[PDB]
Amino acid sequence: SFSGYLKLTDNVYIKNADIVEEAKKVKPTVVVNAANVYLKHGGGVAGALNKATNNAMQVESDDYIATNGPLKVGGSCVLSGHNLAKHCLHVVGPNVNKGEDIQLLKSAYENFNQHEVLLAPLLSAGIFGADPIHSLRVCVDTVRTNVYLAVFDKNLYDKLVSSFL
If you write DSSP's letter for every residue of 62-126 in order, what string do you get? Predict the structure, then answer.
C-alpha cells in the first residue's frame, strides 16, 4: 500500500511525490485528478495523469462530456483509472486564475467523502491559483475518509508540513 507518508490527522497523510509515479507504484482504488469542468487534461496534474495513460483518459473524458455536458465547479465524476488506478475521481476545484469562487473548494473536497481511500493532489493548488496552505486546511476540515496527498514540489511540501496547525 502507501509508504513514506507523514500523518497530519486521523485520516489525512502527505508525501513529497509525483502523483503519476505514486499512482503507478501503488495502483490505488482511486486516484483524484485536478480536473476542469470540460475534462480537458492540458496541464498540471491533469496533463501529467492524462499523458501517463497515453491519452486514454482524454478519449474517455471527451466521450463523457459529449454524453453528459460539463461538470460543475465543485463537482466530480468517476471514470476509469486506466494504468494508474482502478478509478479516477475527476474533481473540479475553483480556478482562482479564472475568477472562480474559492468557497467552492470545500464542495470540491466533499467529493472525496464518497471514497474510503484516495490518492490525491491538493485541490485548486498549482496552476489553479489558490493558496496550497489554505487547500490543505480545507482538506483536513472537510475530508473524513483516508486521503493520501501527493505534493509534487519539495519546497511547497516542506512549507505545508512546517506550517500545518
Answer: HHHHHHH-PPPTT-EEEEE-TTT-SEEEEEE---GGGT--TTHHHHHHHGGGGSSEEEEPPTT-G
Experimentally determined by: X-ray
Nearest to 47 by CA among 132, 137, 121: 121
The CB-side HSE value for 111 (13 A sphere, CA atoms) comes to 27
DSSP-assigned letters across all residues of 29-44: SEEEEEE-TT----SH
User: 30 CB contacts (<8 Å, ≥6 apart)?
Assistant: 81, 85, 86, 87, 88, 89, 115, 117, 118, 119
CA distances from 99 to 65, 104, 130, 164 (A): 23, 12, 11, 27
Q: What does this entry list as its resolution, in Å?
A: 1.2
